[PDB]
Amino acid sequence: GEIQWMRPSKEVGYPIINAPSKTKLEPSAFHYVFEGVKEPAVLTKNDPRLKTDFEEAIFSKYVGNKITEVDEYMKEAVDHYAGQLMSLDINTEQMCLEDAMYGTDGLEALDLSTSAGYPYVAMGKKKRDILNKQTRDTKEMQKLLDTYGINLPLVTYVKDELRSKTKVEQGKSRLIEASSLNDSVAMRMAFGNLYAAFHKNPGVITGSAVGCDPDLFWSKIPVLMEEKLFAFDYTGYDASLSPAWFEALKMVLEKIGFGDRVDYIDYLNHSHHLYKNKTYCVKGGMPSGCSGTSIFNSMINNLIIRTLLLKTYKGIDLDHLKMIAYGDDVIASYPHEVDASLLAQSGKDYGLTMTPADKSATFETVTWENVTFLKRFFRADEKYPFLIHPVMPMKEIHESIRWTKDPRNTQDHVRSLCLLAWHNGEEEYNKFLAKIRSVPIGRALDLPEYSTLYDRWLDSF
């Protein structure tokens, strides 16, 4: 991805967008009961913590576009992946505005907590005014879709979340490129059935984990993998994507019955943005807040790994490439060992920066002992080894519980962390519960005991 031009939203007739200047993150009742080194991310150029220019930092992710055309390897990757998807017999029909807005089997209803994007964010209109579960009314939106249409600018917000100290000082805050409710609805109508097929089929056929449930899915992953695992991390995956990867994605879509609406992908690729009082154009780069961002990033990851394997290992048998991606995150395998270091070198030629899996200093063998996916390890259960525990490190949980955005959501936030924490074992969990109950707020929460979580987990399969 690369910014082609940036200038005053007024010079081009666009309104200034208001972006909160203060974080909603404040120390929680457990701030001092647990150890943690993370702080709220810089949300403005004035933040006393900044040790470098803010604007430069937040846009530095667009490192450029490395490749221009879809080469031979990419085309073969396209053919093979499209070939796999065809076996799912995905309903290629468009989705009725109704299901597209209020959900249906395989597709949750639009989230009312997220921005409605332009122009509504300048007209002060909110999603709650437009839709409404009860009636499941198309009327109002149908009306807004004729008035403003689609292909509207993307509203860019700085993500309000916890970041390391070093990323605070370097203004390395993440951005949320929010789309208009119009486009969000259009695409869900256009690709809704695609989204649903993926959500209902996490695994090695879709090569996607989007919409999965770790508690159950972790037990199926080892079975789906080939003998030898390989992985690696991406630096700025989304922003590094070149236009060619979007073209390859369009090729896959056309091959499975959606050439009908591949123009939509063009907007993800060549995108128009509004940030503050500025407007900019980006060539390439997957926008963070669009409908289908996760699934399209996962599909592209499936094309990328295939491409890098074909380019590095002529004769490779892709039918035995067993991989599962969640956006840029991926867990993959092959019957024979492969060199992630080599794959990484080929990656640069495609505009991708790959590094040792999980911040390793060097590319080392990936094992069931050290592999992670969605930040979780894999640990076979002591009593029933065929059941696999997705193990989220307690450090992650400790960082999260030390902060809050809404004291009214304390119960849900803490309960959620408990559903992640117990997998670390009964001893660890009870210590976690003990610390939570060492302060008044914690003692008033309705939290599940270990035995209860464990027995319910055993019964869920």
C-alpha–C-alpha distance, residues 272 and 287, integer Å = 10
Residue 351 structure tokens: 């505009």
Total residue count of the chain as it appears in this document: 461
Q: Which residues contact 103 (CB under 8 A, 6 or more apart)?
A: 109, 110
Q: Which residues contact 10 (CB under 8 A, 6 or more apart)?
A: 16, 277
CB 220, CB 203: distance < 8 Å: yes
Q: How far is CA 309 from CA 5, 230, 334, 438, in A?
A: 35, 12, 10, 52
Report the DSSP beta bridge partners of residue 281.
5, 272
C-alpha–C-alpha distance, residues 162 and 173, integer Å = 9
Q: Which residues contact 18 (CB under 8 A, 6 or more apart)?
A: none
Q: Which residues contact 131 (CB under 8 A, 6 or more apart)?
A: 101, 102, 110, 112, 137, 140, 141
Classify burial at 270, counting beta carbons within 10 Å of its beta carbon; exposed 0-12, middle 13-18, buried 19 or more: middle
Residue 434 structure tokens: 């003990």
Q: Which residues contact 184 (CB under 8 A, 6 or more apart)?
A: 110, 117, 290, 291
C-alpha–C-alpha distance, residues 367 and 389, integer Å = 15
247: left (phi over 0), alpha (psi -120 to 50) or beta: alpha
DSSP state of 257: I
Buried b (16+ CB within 10 A) or exposed e, 115-154: bbbbbbbeeeeebeebbeeeeebbeebeebbeebebebbb
CA dihedral (125, 44, 65, 330) in degrees, to 10, reads: -80
DSSP state of 210: T
With tokens 């929680």, the residue in question is: 28
Dmax (CA) of the chain: 67
Q: Which residues contact 381 (CB under 8 A, 6 or more apart)?
A: 387, 388, 389
DSSP E strands, 347-445: 354-355, 377-380, 388-391, 403-404
CA angle 97, 197, 156 (to 5 degrees): 60
Query: Which backbone phi and psi does 245 adopt, to 5 degrees?
Result: -65, -30
Residue 136 structure tokens: 């499941």
List the one residue out of 141, 211, 244 whose CA is nearest residue 183: 141
Residues 143, 146, 148, 152, CA torsion sign: positive
103: left (phi over 0), alpha (psi -120 to 50) or beta: left
CB 340, CB 357: distance < 8 Å: yes
DSSP state of 172: -
CA 372 to chain centroid, in Å, comes to 16
Q: What resolution (Å)?
A: 2.0
C-alpha–C-alpha distance, residues 156 and 178, integer Å = 6
Residue 407 structure tokens: 């004291």
Classify burial at 287, counting beta carbons within 10 Å of its beta carbon; exposed 0-12, middle 13-18, buried 19 or more: buried
Q: Which long-range contacts (CB under 8 A, 24 or more apart) does 56-60 make?
A: 56/171, 57/170, 57/171, 57/172, 57/173, 58/158, 58/171, 58/172, 58/173, 58/175, 59/3
CB 403, CB 162: distance < 8 Å: yes
- Give the DSSP H or E segment for 158: strand 154-158
C-alpha–C-alpha distance, residues 219 and 223, integer Å = 8
H-type helices in 202-317, by residue range?
Answer: 214-217, 221-224, 237-240, 243-253, 263-269, 293-312
Residues 213, 216, 220, 221, CA torsion sign: positive
C-alpha–C-alpha distance, residues 385 and 29, integer Å = 37
C-alpha–C-alpha distance, residues 259 and 150, integer Å = 18
Coil, strand, or helix at residue 387? coil
According to the annotation, is 233 in a ligand binding site?
yes
C-alpha–C-alpha distance, residues 391 and 427, integer Å = 14
Query: Cβ–Cβ contacts within 10 Å for residue 240, how many?
Result: 26
C-alpha–C-alpha distance, residues 395 and 227, integer Å = 30
List the one residue out of 97, 154, 158, 160 whose CA is nearest residue 120: 154
Report the DSSP beta bridge partners of residue 373.
376
C-alpha–C-alpha distance, residues 433 and 428, integer Å = 9
CA 189 to chain centroid, in Å, comes to 21
C-alpha–C-alpha distance, residues 344 and 350, integer Å = 10
Q: How far is CA 143 from CA 103, 104, 125, 139, 345, in A?
A: 19, 22, 14, 6, 51
Residue 34 structure tokens: 């647990």
Query: Which backbone phi and psi does 54 adopt, to 5 degrees?
Result: -70, -50
Q: How far is CA 441 from CA 114, 414, 447, in A?
A: 28, 11, 12
CA angle 366, 368, 372 (to 5 degrees): 75
C-alpha–C-alpha distance, residues 435 and 299, integer Å = 42
- Give the DSSP H or E segment for 418: helix 410-421
List the one residue out of 250, 58, 275 whose CA is nearest residue 153: 275
With tokens 């490439």, the residue in question is: 321
H-type helices in 259-409, by residue range?
Answer: 263-269, 293-312, 340-349, 394-401
281: left (phi over 0), alpha (psi -120 to 50) or beta: beta
Query: Cβ–Cβ contacts within 10 Å for residue 450, how many?
Result: 18
According to the annotation, is 146 in a ligand binding site?
no
Domains and CATH numbers, the chain: 1-13+70-202+243-284 (no CATH), 213-242+292-367 (3.30.70.270), 375-461 (1.20.960.20)
Amino acid at 307: T
Query: Cβ–Cβ contacts within 10 Å for residue 59, how many?
Result: 16
C-alpha–C-alpha distance, residues 312 and 257, integer Å = 30
